[model samples]
Target chain A: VVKVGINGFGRIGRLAFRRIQNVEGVEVTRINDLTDPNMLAHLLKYDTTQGRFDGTVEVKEGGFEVNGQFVKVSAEREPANIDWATDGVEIVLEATGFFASKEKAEQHIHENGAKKVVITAPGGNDVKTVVFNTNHDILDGTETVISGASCTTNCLAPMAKALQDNFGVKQGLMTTIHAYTGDQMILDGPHRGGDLRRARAGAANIVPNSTGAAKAIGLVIPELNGKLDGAAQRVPVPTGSVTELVATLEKDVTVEEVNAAMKAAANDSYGYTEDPIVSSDIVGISYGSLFDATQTKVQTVDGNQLVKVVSWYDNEMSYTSQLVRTLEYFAKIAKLE
Target chain B: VVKVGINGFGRIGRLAFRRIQNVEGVEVTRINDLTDPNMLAHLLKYDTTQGRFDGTVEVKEGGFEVNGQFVKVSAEREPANIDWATDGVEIVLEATGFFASKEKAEQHIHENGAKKVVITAPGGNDVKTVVFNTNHDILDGTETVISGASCTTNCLAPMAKALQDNFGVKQGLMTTIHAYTGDQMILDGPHRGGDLRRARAGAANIVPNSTGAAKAIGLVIPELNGKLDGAAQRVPVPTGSVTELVATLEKDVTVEEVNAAMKAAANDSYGYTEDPIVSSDIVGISYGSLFDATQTKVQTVDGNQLVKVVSWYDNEMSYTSQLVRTLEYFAKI
Candidate 1:
């Protein structure tokens, strides 16, 4: 079994803990968040979007009990102070919005602390960013800190891979109709990040924000290096989202053919769908990306063509799923190393 | 003096009418919309983004009387059905956001219809796309139908024109942080145009939509054709927008030099400002494009310089003024 500890038990952190319960061979023994145990146990007992947790969660002294197994929850505001080794933690999942840089995330990898660290964000350009099924092979099991890329990276990687393998992509641009996050203002107010746009009410308007999705994808898929650039539209939905890729392909393709190619590439992490679905329909799905065949568009102009493909994702659980998958695989491989 | 007719009566349409009332020798004799005069005048009386109407408007039995002058408002859904000659209308401002072609626009040239149709969008290559001050010289007196590019085109053209003239452009990419449009859904629903992204809530998300700003720029500046392309991030704001251009230049330059060049090219249509202004500050401004110097960047990696410039435009007012400029010019020509 792979023992894991999660940091910054926010959206991705709690989801990872809940999902880790369903999957075998992986378990989270310790959780480090900014809050105490009571709030953690209560928040774990129920979730607004993901539904109630399967097993009972009750608050204990300095920790919580899950199915009679006492689990520790610590409120460590700083990463260096967290005693990760107390729970025999091998790998730490850095889901905290902070500590995304190499220097900061590596702070968890000291003697008697965590053996390895996996950051759940864009952990710098030098960090080995993995999107699971798309580029997990890049991991050699010896790396200290790994990045799970962005929620959109996992959303777009599979669909982009399917397109690249079927019809080689020459160049592409991405636009994600994404959901609002905690980083945005609830109403028109001051944004701490100084983004004048995000300062507007997130749920009230389509707020334009920048994303590292293309930069992350280029890291995962080298052939697509610097060829893909994209931005995000942070729309009102609280969770599920979709991405559209307008690309020039190396080979000509029809809409039906492109949809079929996406189906052939479907896996446990990547999904394919034909029914006309909306953002709400994909709220709790586990697939990093569900390719919507209904949105497959092939625009042919003057014998030249530009193809567009869209994929839906539950940004909350999508990256959480990929994060756990990467953590599980990294731990499993570490045993052999 | 040329009597003009307006179509759609949407944001651009009403703003054009509002600005046209201030100009001489040009009067809106007829207005066409799918809605009745009640809501039409109500919309004209007040705008959410552009503010209240400049002049008084009163609803009549047939049309509306604006500032005491009675204007005919027709509920013509079809372009060919509207008899423009009945009102002696010679030019039509196709602000309805529907008709964008020569063939579709020529329908307005009915037996007694208008002689010229001005599309408030990027008309096809066959149609001359005018950005007022940037490529208005391309317009001759004989053209029957013309395009007033787009809101972003008018915003991006002068900035790009100045950049090209100062530092030869090798290639470039554009990204417009734009405002949401009526084309998007108020909430997540089916988009008739089949754009899944747009089918989502417009005001609630930073929706990514397609734009022809760069492609339209190529039309105005032929030297940049096939060298430029861009994407749009439609944010929550109702109006006001900014465009960022990333280009590799043939000549090396500093941030100050580029800003100086842009200021040198500033005229009545193109605005230059060193103010640290946001989107709301640029709202209702008359300049087609306002070059904001605060966002300029000149980066060199391995001795290769990539230049970036940002300009703000009020999507509603900027385009409206440029369209009126093109309207008066086309009407007189």
Candidate 2:
């Protein structure tokens, strides 16, 4: 089995632990979290949004036993302090969302004995942020650090590639109707000086936040770099994020052509839904994104075709699925090498 | 005062009654709904989503008293059945969402004594579906029937116009994150065969419904006819709605130029909010729409400038405000 170590046990961290059990050839050997082992077990046992866990979870001497799996837990806030070598960790899935740069993520490798490091969120240019099935071919075993990209980018990049491949994309834009993340306060409060709008209550209103979804699209699709712009609306929903995109085409295209291209591309990576579906229906979906054909609108504006695509994705689980898929990909490459 | 008659005491109709009291030249003279006067009074007094009404609401012998304003109530479901002349109602704000055509809305004018009719939603090709600030100029006050348009169209038209006027919009698309309406089921059940999605639980899922916001834009801005296409996501939110738009411009433009144009255009009709704002903050806002500058994104693709704008509006009060504003405009022009 491929022994794995998880570096931060928050939303993504906790989820990766639960989801890793199902993936073949992968087993989590160690978990690192700032919370105590018992507290971590308790928190994992009962999640507010995701509901309670099913199996047994008990705090052991130095770690917690989740569903009879005796995985060691380390209360290390810093990546350098974790001992991945002693636990036989072949790869470290760094999910803390704290170490957001290549240099920072590299600390998990240089200091800790992690054979490879994968970040759950996107970071600096040093590490490659790969959207699964879109540009994962760029990854060779030689790379030490990699990124799974964010939920919004995962939903956007593939559609961008599909359209850019078939009809040819002149320009594109995205507006993610996202669920509130842990970064914002539950109620109205003071935040960092520069960003006051996020300081407003999140549960009460739909907070308008900045998104790197546009920037991440550039990283995957280089030809459209700096050409794509995006914004985000953090609505008061618990789960399910929808990315609304407008792609200005290279030539006039019909809704049928666009839908066919999207449907074929969707089967290879994410999922596709033609019927009316909503955010809650995609709660535990495994696909990176779902191209919704029912909401698709296409029009030719001044000799150029404009396409509007609405993508539905469960940000939490879908991103976690990407994380596990990336791990499997890393393990497969390592095995072949 | 311009005497008004409101048809259908649902969400929009009741809101028009509460709001028209504040409008200087408008007064709601009569109300019509299938609900009894006492039940309607209780509904107006204690709304589950909108909260309790502050003033006293009582059912009198002939009608109901809203904060001591005596208004008559009719239990007529048919538009042509209500007596508008006896109440001296010069105009009728038809909000039933039932009369969806100009021929049907004109029934109120032909059978009832009302001089003019304003539909709360989009109607047939004969009537004008004017976004108050965008294309109310098309109305000469000679027409007996008009449409105030849907909540999504009301929020989209002004911003589309501003962008079309200054930057010269090449094309546009809108996805409205709208609140749930009265038509959909609160819980999952069987609906009409064609509308299975809306039959599902509304409080649980974000129903993707067909929207005419894009087509309505063509009604106001003739240049954008057949050019704009749109969709709708009926979210779980109760009151507020937001329209996310992407407009392909004629040429490359800076965010500053677009911001300046939007802020200036926001003055007379709609509102603009640069601060970090949400849907709840715009609840009960009087303006037709609010230009969210904080969420505005502009970029150049293939030498063409593309602009993204997010608009926040209260679908009920703002649409009610537009209905009242349309009445005031009719009185003025």
Candidate 3:
């Protein structure tokens, strides 16, 4: 089995472990976090948005054991303090979402002796950010730090590339109807830091916030750098996000053609559903992006065709599933078996 | 005083009565609905989304009295059967979203003694669909029936006009992140007749439905015909609504220019707040639309400039406020 270690047992961390345990060739050797093992096990067993854990989970000395599989755990906050070599972890999924720089994430490999470090969220300049379907092929065996990007970027890249490849978009805009995260307060309070909107009540209002998803799309597809503009509205929902894309096509095309191209891409890597879906319906889907072909609308404006397509993704479940896929891809490249 | 009559006292009707009573020249002389006066009094006193009535409301023999102001209530569903002439009601604000045809709404004028009827939602052809900021000047007071469109149209029109007037819009698209309405179910069940998505739970999922807000825009500005398309996602929220607009302009313009134009429009008719505002903050504002300037983004693609503008509205409060404005415009003409 391919052995893996997870750093930071938050939303992405806990879910990543739950998903990796199900993959036939993969096993989570250890999980590193600052929380007590019992408490972590309790959280992994129950979640408010996602209901109860499917299998039985029992707390252990340093970690938890689920479904006859044992995993070692440590209460270390820093990456350098974790024991990666002794645990025999070939690839480390750094899900802390705190360390965004390549240099900071690289310390997990260089100082801690982990084979490879894959970040769960997007950030950092030196490492390669692989949106699995779009640019995962760019990941060579030589790279040490890999970024899975944010959940929004993973949903955006695939939908954007499919349209850009088929219709040739002149300009595009994306509005992510995203769900509130842990970073936001449940009720309104003080503006603590970077964005003041985050201080607003997440459960009360549809808060407007900035996203780096547009800039992240540029990293994979160079042609879309100056052409794409993105904005986000964090609604009151706990999970599931929608990216509404409106693009000005380079050439005239029908809505059927646009739907056909995306539907075909749906079979390959993306999730395609014509079943009149809503946000909550896409909760545990495995695709990187779910395209609603029924809502595909194209109209002619001033002799030019404007296309509107919407994509959905489950931020916690699908994102974690894709993060594990990234780990498997990197583990094979490292020749770990 | 401009004597007003209201029909179908639902969300828009009850809220309109509360608003029109507060306006200077408008007085709601009568409200026509099939609801019993006592039960109607209870509904007027208590609403689930909007809280308890601030002032005292007492049920009368056929109507209710709120804060010493009394309105005659009639148990008639048909517009032609209501006694508007006896109540001295001149203009009828048909808050009932059921009637869409101009001939149907105009029955209040022809059969009953009402002079003009204003529809609260969009429908039909011959009657004017007035969005105050975009095409209010088109009202010549000769038409007997008027449509106030829906809440989404009120938010979309002003922003679309501002962009089209300044930089010239080649085309536009609008997606309304709207609140769930009375038509939707609180939980999933069997769809009744027309809309299957309506059968889905409103509190659980974002229901995608059809919106004629785009076609309504064409009624105001004829040039936008075949140029704009719209869709809606009925979110789980109860009150606030968002209209996310993406338009391809005729020429290139900077983001600053678009902001300045909308900011100028804010002073005239719309509500423009750059203060990191959310949906709930604009709950009771008396503007046609609230433009989020900070979220306004514009970029150049190929040889054309693409603009992104987000507008907010309290679908219940703000749309009713604008409906009052439409009433006053007709009251003037």
Top candidate, metric TM-score:
3
Clashing pairs in 3: none
Model 2 docking grade: medium
Chain A TM-score per model, please list them: 0.96, 0.94, 0.95
Per-candidate DockQ vs. reference: 0.13, 0.57, 0.67
Better of 2 and 3 by TM-score: 3
Q: Which window of 10 residues has the lowest lDDT sum in candidate 3 chain A?
A: A328-337
Q: Candidates' TM-scores?
A: 0.75, 0.94, 0.96
The DockQ ranking, best first, is: 3, 2, 1
Worst 10 residues of 1 chain A by lDDT: A297-306
Which one wins on lDDT?
1
lDDT of 3 by residue, B1-333 (tens): 889999988999988887776789889989898887888788889977667887889987767787888889998867889879888898999887778888888888854569988899775878888887778888887888888878888888888888878877777888888888878877877767557788888876767888888755878777776677888887778889888888787767887888899988774347787788877887767776888888887777656777888888989888888899898788669
Full ranking by lDDT: 1, 3, 2
lDDT of 2 by residue, B1-333 (tens): 889988888988888888887778788889988887878898889877566786888899778887778899988767778888889888888888889798888877854467788888777888888788888988877888888888888888888888888878777778787777767888877876458778877766667788878875788788888778777777667788888787777767787888888988975568887776777778888888888887777877556777787788898877778878887787556
Indicate the TM-score of model 3. Answer: 0.96
| Residue-level error in angstroms, candidate 2, position A206 | 2.2
Q: State which docking tier applies to candidate 1.
A: incorrect
Worst 10 residues of 1 chain B by lDDT: B297-306
| True-vs-predicted CA distance for residue A5, candidate 2, Å | 0.3
